[PDB]
Structure formats: C-alpha cells, structure tokens
C-alpha cells in the first residue's frame, strides 16, 4: 500500500511535468517555424516588389 | 490504498492530456493565426514597393 500510493503521486506528478515540457518544446518549434516561413513571406514579397 | 491511489492517478493523467491538448490546439491555433497575419502584411507591403 505504502509502495503503491507512493508511486502513484509521484510518477503521475513527473508524467504530466513531462507533458508539460513536450508542449513547451513542440509550441516552441511552432513559433521557430512559423518565424521562418514568416520570413520566407518576407523574402518572397521583397523579390516581387523587386522585379515589379 | 488502491482506491485513493488509482483514482487520483488516472484523473491526473486525463488532465494532464487534457492540458497538453489545449496547448496543440492554442499552439497550431496561434501559429495559423500568425500565418493569416504574415499574408495580410505582406500584401501591404508589396503595396508599398508598387506605391513607391
């Protein structure tokens, strides 16, 4: 019983920590990427504006 | 024992999903968001090299 509850808290608790950190990574990723292509949106209006 | 242990244990872990979940939704959610607006900027910025 003792062992049990013990790593129920516990593990439950560092699983949904480590969820945590996975969204914080994947959103991270999502601001990266949309920064990027963002960018290449950029890029891409420039050479238009260019040879216009 | 069990009962306490398991019930707090598996309502944390829908939880936790839970979370995880609304951030992929804010996350995408966001990162379209940010795409939409990359578009509208960038059309008026090719306005503006045309403007000039």
Do not use: M
Not at 28 to 36: F, N, P, V, Y
């Amino acid at each position: 019983l003792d062992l049990a509850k013990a790593s129920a808290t516990d593990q439950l608790k560092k699983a949904k920590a480590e969820a945590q950190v996975i969204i914080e990574q994947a959103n991270k990723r999502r601001s990266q990427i949309l920064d990027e292509a963002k960018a290449e949106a950029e890029q891409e209006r420039t050479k238009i504006v260019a040879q216009a």
